[PDB]
Amino acid sequence: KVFGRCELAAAMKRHGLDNYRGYSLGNWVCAAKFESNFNTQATNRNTDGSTDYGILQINSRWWCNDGRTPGSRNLCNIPCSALLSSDITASVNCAKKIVSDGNGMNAWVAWRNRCKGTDVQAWIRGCRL
């Protein structure tokens, strides 16, 4: 599914990512925007042979199992294909462990390079309240 901006902010809020580990909702929406363009089905291979999956481009190296990534830790105890669902529950549950692993949202290099430092609340503008 390709999420609308406000629609994904809604889902993310309801699934508890707003202020999760100190990161406001605009931060999570901005990172989904530049990781996946709000598309749950987005998959992108990395140069180390692991692949990134879904709305927040969660890596098969540490977090989810895809079978084709030697060394895979699968710390979210999940198949990577489950991160591609219409319902973002699993991607958010896994994201909560990644933001907590020590480097915050710097784990998302798209968030670190684009979003971090910027006006991220622009990403929840006009959205219902």
Swiss-Prot record:
It is found in: Secreted. The active site is at 35, 52. It comes from the Eukaryota. In the egg white and polymorphonuclear leukocytes. It is an enzyme of class 3 (hydrolase). Substrate binds at residue 101. One of its GO terms (biological process) is defense response to bacterium. Its EC number is 3.2.1.17. GO terms for cellular component: cytoplasm; endoplasmic reticulum; extracellular space. Lysozyme C is capable of both hydrolysis and transglycosylation; it also shows a slight esterase activity. It acts rapidly on both peptide-substituted and unsubstituted peptidoglycan, and slowly on chitin oligosaccharides. Lysozymes have primarily a bacteriolytic function; those in tissues and body fluids are associated with the monocyte-macrophage system and enhance the activity of immunoagents. Has bacteriolytic activity against M.luteus. Monomer. This is Lysozyme C. It comes from Gallus gallus.
